């Protein structure tokens, strides 16, 4: 479960997501608009990350590191399907 990995892992995973994206991820899985705002407003905090907020939130909801990969794969695979759609 995502909110239960060690800080280095979670921290490492979140900043990598902080460049791309977390709204697409969040959108692909589902978790609501107002749930996401807690996350969006993280950016106001000098060092803060919405992805960190998002992953912990996803963790709490019951997401494993294998469900996460399922999502990121789908994210990759629907980006192209989108890009080649009329």
Curated annotation (Swiss-Prot):
Highly expressed in peripheral blood mononuclear cells. Detected at lower levels in bone marrow, thymus and lymph node, and at very low levels in colon and lung. It comes from the Eukaryota. Residues 11-86 form the Death domain. It is found in: Cytoplasm, Perinuclear region; Nucleus. It is linked to Immunodeficiency 12: A primary immunodeficiency characterized by onset in infancy of recurrent bacterial and candidal infections resulting in bronchiectasis and growth delay. Manifestations include mastoiditis, aphthous ulcers, cheilitis, gingivitis, esophagitis, gastritis, duodenitis, and meningitis. Levels of absolute lymphocytes and serum immunoglobulins are normal, but specific antibody titers are low despite immunization, and T-cells show impaired proliferative responses to mitogens. Protease that enhances BCL10-induced activation: acts via formation of CBM complexes that channel adaptive and innate immune signaling downstream of CARD domain-containing proteins (CARD9, CARD11 and CARD14) to activate NF-kappa-B and MAP kinase p38 pathways which stimulate expression of genes encoding pro-inflammatory cytokines and chemokines. Mediates BCL10 cleavage: MALT1-dependent BCL10 cleavage plays an important role in T-cell antigen receptor-induced integrin adhesion. Involved in the induction of T helper 17 cells (Th17) differentiation. Belongs to the peptidase C14B family. Homooligomer; forms oligomers which bind to TRAF6. Forms a complex with CARD14 and MALT1; resulting in the formation of a CBM (CARD14-BCL10-MALT1) complex. Forms a complex with CARD11 and MALT1; resulting in the formation of a CBM (CARD11-BCL10-MALT1) complex. Forms a complex with CARD9 and MALT1; resulting in the formation of a CBM (CARD9-BCL10-MALT1) complex. This is Mucosa-associated lymphoid tissue lymphoma translocation protein 1. It comes from Homo sapiens. The gene is MALT1. The chain holds residues 29 to 124 of 824 of the full protein.
């Amino acid at each position: 479960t995502l909110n239960r990995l060690r800080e280095p892992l979670l921290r490492r995973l979140s900043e990598l997501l902080d460049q791309a994206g977390w709204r697409r991820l969040a959108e692909l899985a589902g978790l609501s608009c107002l749930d996401l705002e807690q996350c969006s407003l993280k950016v106001l905090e000098p060092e803060g990350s919405p992805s960190l907020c998002l992953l912990k939130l996803m963790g709490e909801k019951g997401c494993t590191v294998t469900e996460l990969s399922d999502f990121l794969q789908a994210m990759e695979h629907t980006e192209v399907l989108q890009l080649l759609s009329p």
